[PDB]
Symmetry: C2
């Protein structure tokens, strides 16, 4: 059952101290890197939404880092994902990835910032290798609650995209999970 | 795999058109029936919290009814639980049982009203026979999302009690699920 490290674009294992852009290998329209953005009509003082660009010719994605629970980043393990940007203090809260409350309109939960690090709230994610090529993010929210007969009593869902206000919003999906790669800086 | 009906205090199968108090067989301090109550400092125009009384000598619980997805009420099936009381219109929304957003303080979700009937939001519950005596409520929120490898891709959690502002608040628990019986009116 030996823990396998997640790996970057260069093949080198993922490192807590490093920074990575979460990139697609999608060509053209199918490409687009993950970035921090303002949410459609957000009350939030900072940008709090989690998006990807629309085409590969879009700007480079926002860097993020990974904070595991141990000292290493393995596949299939709870961890936190935090945009790594310099910032004004009000905003430092709003870099940590989080899964939002059920959005009735979309019938699922969107990814946003202002999560917390090291706690069993909405801020937990997993990395897993894609059924195709590259990696998939899962959200395992509510690990503080027993998921009856679920694997390890946890509820997890694959992360995908929904189109909110014509952008690409990262949300929980059931199929077509976002395939990603991690490209060190 | 033959569907089994849930049963009332008299032994008679549970009926959609009927009303029931959700009662405990707890003696004295251990007793207390489920009722509709105002939530600690609620912004809500109506009472929106789901409570049980503190002792068996407390008043009779609030009647509720069950709205299945078929025409029958079986164990282990998604359904809606709605307080059955006459009401002013503003409030008719706030009878349907619902599971709230993660409450960070309690580290779980509380039961409240203003859920919806017939949709895969936070308003879904299951009835199951208790490992002890009587029945347990489960909440299966988020059935619109695949729970990876979970039973039937659903996330479910047992319903219990937490002490909020010194009352008994129905919430999602991991152990000591509330044992209940359904007593027709």
């Amino acid at each position: 059952p030996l823990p396998k490290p997640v790996l970057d674009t260069n093949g080198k294992e993922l490192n807590p101290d490093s920074s990575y852009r979460i990139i697609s290998i999608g060509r053209g329209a199918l490409g687009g890197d993950v970035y921090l953005g303002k949410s459609p009509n957000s009350d939030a003082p900072c940008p709090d939404g989690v998006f990807r660009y629309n085409s590969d010719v879009g700007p480079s994605g926002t860097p993020v880092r990974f904070i595991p629970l141990s000292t290493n980043i393995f596949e299939d393990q709870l961890l936190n994902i935090q945009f790594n940007i310099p910032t004004v203090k009000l905003c430092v809260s709003y870099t940590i990835w989080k899964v939002g409350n059920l959005n009735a309109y979309f019938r699922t939960m969107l990814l946003e910032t202002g999560g917390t690090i090291g706690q069993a709230d909405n801020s937990y994610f997993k990395i897993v290798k894609s059924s195709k090529i590259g990696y998939n993010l899962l959200s395992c929210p509510f690990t503080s609650i027993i998921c009856l007969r679920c694997p390890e009593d946890q509820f997890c869902a694959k992360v995908g995209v929904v189109i909110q206000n014509g952008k690409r919003r990262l949300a929980l999906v059931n199929e077509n999970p976002l395939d990603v790669l991690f490209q060190e800086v």
